Design a protein around this ligand. Structure first.
Ligand code: HEM
Ligand code: HEM
Lengths: 145, 145
């Protein structure tokens, strides 16, 4: 369950999540667009899911893609600020999951975000240990999908 | 249009937004549920829109409502963080608009939020000048509906 998944994020994982977010979160426009573009480059099959965003090849130039990327970063910001209270983390994760469930995104597909996140972290000198801490947070959301 | 609305956000207006958000933004969960509950009390005509949240009268105890309130606060967070770049502000307000547009929320409906905001601010010692500042931020979203 979502609680089980969340309830496991240990004090060390919370620390790595926060430390890394201090950096990749300080520049939401840049990193967020980086996440999306990388996701499209490595998993072309997901481009169709974003038809409403227009031409995603435009990158930073596409306002729809830019506004979406910035907003996505605030969803993560929200998850990070609720790390100390499982109760709050869970209920916010639940609301969030609804959007991707109606979007027909399965747990396995949503998991594809791991690759990109890993690459954005690396570009900032945050190795495997950190990528793993993020896969745990991503796992909490997967438990609600 | 939206851009003309964004221009209304002058140095003073943006300054008042930041100064107040610094206080009401430190307790997203607290102030978030206050806005929501103040709305349902001053405008029972809108409760129908939040059928999915269940018994909103419950307040903080309602998990679905609490998660929604918190998330709502991050949306505003996103707007305040884009006050320097109207371009960024506009693209995010647009993505945001698409959410309520699909919920059949008209600009007239959205404007009803000004009342609650004004009351939450006042409970934190923020007067009309401040409520007038947020009124303009809200108008940007309205021009996008
Ligand atoms: C780190 C994980 C992710 C986060 C935080 C996230 C965040 C978001 C947010 C906040 C929205 C809606 C924003 C708005 O409407 O203003 C959204 C929508 C959506 N997401 Fe994600 N997402 C994530 C991963 C994914 C993945 C992996 C996929 C695809 C394989 C995906 C597919 C979608 C789709 C189809 C929409 C609808 C976009 C539209 O048509 O406007 N998301 N996401
Ligand atoms: C301060 C202004 C407002 C902000 C920043 C705001 C923010 C939000 C956010 C972030 C969501 C949830 C996004 C998601 O999870 O998909 C949302 C959903 C919604 N909003 Fe607003 N909103 C505002 C005012 C209003 C007003 C005035 C109404 C009603 C007259 C309204 C009606 C709705 C409805 C019906 C939903 C969907 C609820 C659900 O099914 O979970 N909003 N809003």
């Amino acid at each position: 369950s979502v609680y089980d998944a969340a309830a496991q994020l240990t004090a060390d994982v919370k620390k790595d999540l926060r430390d890394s977010w201090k950096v990749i979160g300080s520049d939401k426009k840049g990193n967020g667009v980086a996440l999306m573009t990388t996701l499209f480059a490595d998993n072309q099959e997901t481009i169709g899911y974003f038809k409403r965003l227009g031409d995603v090849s435009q990158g930073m130039a596409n306002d729809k893609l830019r506004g979406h990327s910035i907003t996505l970063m605030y969803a993560l910001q929200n998850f990070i600020d609720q790390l100390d209270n499982p109760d709050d983390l869970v209920c916010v994760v639940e609301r969030f999951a609804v959007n991707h469930i109606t979007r027909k995104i399965s747990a396995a597909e949503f998991g594809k975000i791991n690759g990109p996140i890993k690459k954005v972290l690396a570009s900032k000198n945050f190795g495997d240990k950190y990528a793993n801490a993020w896969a745990k947070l991503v796992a909490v959301v997967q438990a609600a999908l």
